[PDB]
Structure formats: structure tokens, C-alpha cells
Amino acid sequence: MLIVPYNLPLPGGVVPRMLITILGTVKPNANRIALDFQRGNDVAFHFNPRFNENNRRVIVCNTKLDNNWGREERQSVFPFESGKPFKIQVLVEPDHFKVAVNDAHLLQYNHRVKKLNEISKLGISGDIDLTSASYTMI
Numbered sequence: 001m002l003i004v005p006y007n008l009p010l011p012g013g014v015v016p017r018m019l020i021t022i023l024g025t026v027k028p029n030a031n032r033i034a035l036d037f038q039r040g041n042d043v044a045f046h047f048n049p050r051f052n053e054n055n056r057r058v059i060v061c062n063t064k065l066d067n068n069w070g071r072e073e074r075q076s077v078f079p080f081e082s083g084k085p086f087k088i089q090v091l092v093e094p095d096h097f098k099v100a101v102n103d104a105h106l107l108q109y110n111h112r113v114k115k116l117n118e119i120s121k122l123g124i125s126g127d128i129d130l131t132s133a134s135y136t137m138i
């Protein structure tokens with residue numbers, strides 16, 4: 001019931017101890033999901049579940065700088081299921097983003113973009129019904 005793509009402002013950027021929670025349901029014949037933590041036009045952290053990349057399910061993570069994608073980091077563990085409700089938690093830690101899905105740790109992504117306080121937007125897109133997007137400090 002939120003409109004997708006959805007932009008969640010992150011006022012003053014991110015900081016260690018900030019927890020971002022996304023609740024939604026994957027659409028039945030989903031192809032992709034994306035979370036894009038942005039620093040202006042750059043994408044500090046792109047989190048991209050792909051449901052059918054050569055008939056395999058994979059999560060691709062990357063950074064986009066000056067319109068150029070970098071080296072992908074790929075994860076073979078794939079917790080999403082078409083048609084099913086999910087929870088994504090992204091905890092900012094000093095050295096990484098730490099991602100858990102459905103309360104199970106999934107992956108960490110080392111900070112490539114250093115100016116955490118300038119990562120001031122989260123875009124949420126793809127083949128989901130989005131229920132809520134929020135943040136809190138733990």
C-alpha cells in the first residue's frame with residue numbers, strides 16, 4: 001500500500017546504530033527487488049535480489065559512483081519467495097551494512113562510500129507490495 005518505487009529520506013545520512021526496516025510482500029511472479037542507499041546520484045549500497053538470472057536466484061550487491069557500477073558482491077543464500085511477506089533489516093555498523101531477512105542474518109557489505117552522513121536517501125523498488133519503511137536507533 002506504499003507506492004513503489006518509494007523514497008525514504010534518511011535525515012543527516014546514516015550512522016552506526018541506525019536500523020532500517022522494510023516490510024512488504026513479494027509479488028507472485030517476481031523478477032527483482034532493489035534497495036538503493038544513495039549519496040546524491042551515487043549509490044552507496046545497492047541490494048538487488050534477482051529471481052531469475054539464468055534460472056538461478058541470487059542477491060547482487062554493488063556501489064555506483066559517477067554513474068559507474070563497481071565490483072559486485074554476490075550471495076547464493078536467497079531468503080525471498082514469490083508471493084510471501086518478508087522483513088528486511090539493514091543495520092549500519094561502523095565497517096559495514098549488516099542485512100538480516102526474516103530475522104536471519106544474510107550478508108554484510110563493507111562501506112565503499114565513506115561519508116555515511118551524506119547517504120541521505122533510501123530508494124525501494126521492484127516487484128513488491130510495500131507495507132512500511134522506517135528507521136530507528138538501537
Ligand SMILES: COc1cccc(C(=O)N[C@H]2[C@@H](O)[C@@H](CO)O[C@@H](S[C@@H]3O[C@H](CO)[C@H](O)[C@H](NC(=O)c4cccc(OC)c4)[C@H]3O)[C@@H]2O)c1
Pocket residue numbers: 032046048060061062069070072074
Ligand atoms: C532491471 O531494472 C532496473 C531498474 C533500475 C536499475 C537497474 C540497475 O541499474 N540494475 C543494474 C545493477 O543491478 C547492477 C549491479 O552491478 O547490475 C546490472 S547487470 C550487470 O551487468 C554487468 C555488465 O554491465 C555484468 O554482466 C554483471 N555481472 C557480473 O558482474 C557478475 C559477477 C560475478 C558473477 C557473475 O555471475 C553470473 C556475474 C551484471 O550483474 C544491472 O543492470 C535495473
